[PDB]
Ligand binder design. Sequence first.
Ligand code: HEM
Ligand code: HEM
Ligand SMILES: *Cc1c(COP(=O)(O)O)cnc(C)c1O
Ligand SMILES: *Cc1c(COP(=O)(O)O)cnc(C)c1O
Lengths: 498, 498
Amino acid sequence: PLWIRPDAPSRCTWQLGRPASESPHHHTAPAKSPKILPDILKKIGDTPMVRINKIGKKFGLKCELLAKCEFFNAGGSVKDRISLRMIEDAERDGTLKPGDTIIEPTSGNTGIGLALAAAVRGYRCIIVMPEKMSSEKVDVLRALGAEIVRTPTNARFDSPESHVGVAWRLKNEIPNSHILDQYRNASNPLAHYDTTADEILQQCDGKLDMLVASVGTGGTITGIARKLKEKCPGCRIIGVDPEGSILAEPEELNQTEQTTYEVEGIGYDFIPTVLDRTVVDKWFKSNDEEAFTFARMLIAQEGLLCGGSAGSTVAVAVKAAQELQEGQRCVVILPDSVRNYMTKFLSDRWMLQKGFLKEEDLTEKKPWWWHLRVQELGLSAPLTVLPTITCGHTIEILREKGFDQAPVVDEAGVILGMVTLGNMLSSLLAGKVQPSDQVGKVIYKQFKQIRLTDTLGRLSHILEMDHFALVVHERQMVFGVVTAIDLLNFVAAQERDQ
Amino acid sequence: PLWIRPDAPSRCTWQLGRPASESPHHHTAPAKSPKILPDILKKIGDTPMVRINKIGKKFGLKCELLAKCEFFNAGGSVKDRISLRMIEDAERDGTLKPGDTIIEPTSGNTGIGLALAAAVRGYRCIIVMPEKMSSEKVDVLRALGAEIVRTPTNARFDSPESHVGVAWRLKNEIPNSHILDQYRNASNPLAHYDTTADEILQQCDGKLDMLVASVGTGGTITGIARKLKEKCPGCRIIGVDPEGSILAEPEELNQTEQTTYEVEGIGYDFIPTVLDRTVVDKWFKSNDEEAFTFARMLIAQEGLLCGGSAGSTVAVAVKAAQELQEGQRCVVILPDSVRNYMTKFLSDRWMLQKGFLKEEDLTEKKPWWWHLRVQELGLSAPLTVLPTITCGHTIEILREKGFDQAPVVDEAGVILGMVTLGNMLSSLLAGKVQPSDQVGKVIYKQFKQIRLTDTLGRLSHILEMDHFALVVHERQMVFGVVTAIDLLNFVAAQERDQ
Ligand code: HEM
Ligand code: HEM
Ligand SMILES: *Cc1c(COP(=O)(O)O)cnc(C)c1O
Ligand SMILES: *Cc1c(COP(=O)(O)O)cnc(C)c1O
């Protein structure tokens, strides 16, 4: 029966204070990045340590708050590291032959790093990930050439349908295939122990008072915390676990209602082999709301384009470093980029749909003019023209009636678009078009519709995807054409009273 | 009348051979990146020079093909550079006060860099971009806190509705607002002349035989080509223009049918001030197909996650460096990341929808088993259960009938999902659930449907978004449940004949 248990307790005999000389493992030092990178894989590591200027103090931190930004790696996640190490170690092992197939269960970042490295190094790749993870990860993977298999999100790691189970079943059916097994592989936390912690230590010049990291496989926090407990004994290690996962200690903290959560990449229903919970000094629970709030905040305030787990981490950090005082510094790990989450926590519609943003929370911060009917804009019914009308003729019409723009509406009363006087003239002067040509040749095709009873805020959101907003009867009937500028002119006029 | 013409010829008096001492402009040297970055903006520049190993030789290049990967910048595009420079110069100018509003017309990358820098440095930001650009750019921008206005893509730069026009109209209506004007600003090509070209020169140790870049505002190719013609006179400069734009020389090359194209960020209906076409040694036309092909190829082969303009560039480069021979090297500029294009050229559905991929081109590379009806899988009609059934009871049923899994179908014949024997047992042993509990507590909710007449390839694509594929009558009737593994077992059996 070959399925190796991912939650198997660690056989590692490391304990704080064992001389490094005693370690069986193969260790690699970070190497200086060259002038010319010979391949893309060398762009992994040497990530920037960027300071958190605003978010720290907004919450009243007396300390220095640092972020190790790992989304600057080639694959765009902290997983690219282990992804390299694993494969490289698997080549020195002689276990991984050229042309072999690599199969991995993953949150999907590890999958990205691996499929990438495969694309470069000529390995076939098969990634198994939960149904929960974002479609962006899928798009990137399929672009890298990796075959993709999905597993239910409700599956237990014990059950055959889980990503671990499906990975193994695939290994057993496929020749020359290996499972690099990020949960049990020593290469994973060794990646962080050898490089990431060396980096964090060098960048901080040895002075470090706290570290905070979200816990996945547990490789990051483990690998870091071991080298930290060795080289920086004073440093406290703080873990972040989502509600619904079991990772945190003590167990009391795990008692909760939801078994599912929206944050991708962190937390599990089992304790992975590579996770050493003994090196973690304190655990904190984060939830989905805290996560996305603080992620959005990282973006808007610090200008770090990063994913949700990062939000969980920082949300925890501002609570955890409160005990710190001036002169101390706290490093926080930011795992991956916004690239994965584009249609999820980055999109307001999804945030509403999943109920993290209440419409109230939005509306309170919004201006006076936000809740107002569009009718109050002073719209004027525009002249309409047929698509089959002739250009110069339309100019004659627009000038003769004194109109600057017209919606082009079909014979059937279907609005096809817009033509503007300006674009017409400019197009003519240039000889791009003739006075005898169809007006369709110059029509701006794209627009959006609204009721006279819609809120101006609605208009705002629309005006972010379109230039023209046609207020329409519930028709061939256009009560008005509203652009962004017109809304401006409205508000600015309402200003010159006070 | 304040609208400054973007296509205004350059007032720059530089000509090759003027001593740099004579230059009026303020020049900045690239600075060594610190241990701790004090803010994120310091992550701009020092981009990697990564070699192209496969794509070069596949097309028979005898030369060394290098890529300057600019998507590693903080905002994820080459625009972050000018975005910094512009703002920084605007602060030394004393023109930009704290709290001022910055308004920019843009392809959207410049907008991202600018809005980012605004988020960091406390400037209000308003970005005007065409309706054509991708919604991802919008999502990122809105996340950074920038207000967004869109303009028709058919608008001429002369007409008031163009992004340039709308930008200016906004400057004129808004107090404390400035237009940094990437088309006319010297800060833009000076950014590349001062840093990017210094970088390219250092990384290549002075030996460079060719440079290829796509042309936007023209800042990149200009700024680079000037310092190149000064410091590396032998180097040929090659520009890339999309079909439908006017940028290329001589004019004969521009004669074309389409006025529109899908590639974002490059090409224009006018020649920007900052573009110096005299330093460009030869021009090449690229189109949409070449672009997306080669972009996808960059990803799949070289593992560079990058956008379309990059594809145009490389597609040109493999044609242009053919004249080169062994021992020479050619640098190619890769502007931005895949982040922007996720739902466009990265998604196969969009590639089909826009007709760049013909279904034939796909099907030819696909295996023997690709065109086969799903019926040929040997499906077995599964036992169905009600959502209201009890857990232990379902176990009794599944074991008693020898079935391992059942679709959970509603009383109304609506399929709600799946329960598997394994997940049931594992859940019970763990005490997560009781024998008396509703089966709904453990249902895998997500699946997809197919006809018995569907192609196995269809099944493949589906099996990338879902674990379960339920083949269904056109109903309460499930002819079978197909997972990825089952398709594997099918094919692998069809293998053991030969
Ligand atoms: C003096 C230091 C260390 C010693 C003596 C040591 C020793 C060992 C040994 C002997 C094993 C294999 C047990 C077996 O399979 O029979 C092992 C496994 C492992 N080691 Fe270490 N180790 C050290 C440090 C580390 C560090 C710093 C890390 C990473 C943070 C690490 C990661 C692992 C992992 C993930 C395993 C796999 C556990 C398993 O296969 O069940 N080791 N270690
Ligand atoms: C010895 C070298 C150079 C000299 C003497 C020089 C001179 C000038 C002068 C005098 C102007 C302003 C004309 C006016 O507004 O009255 C100008 C504008 C400008 N310069 Fe240079 N320049 C040099 C190099 C460069 C380089 C290397 C770049 C960037 C690649 C550059 C970029 C620009 C740009 C974009 C303008 C704006 C043109 C306009 O406002 O219409 N200059 N230059
Ligand atoms: C894997 C991952 C983590 C967790 O890192 P571990 O080393 O597994 O603890 C956090 N966030 C994201 C996005 C991840 O992919
Ligand atoms: C701006 C841009 C370019 C062109 O660079 P220029 O310096 O304007 O010539 C190419 N690709 C993308 C994605 C861009 O945003």
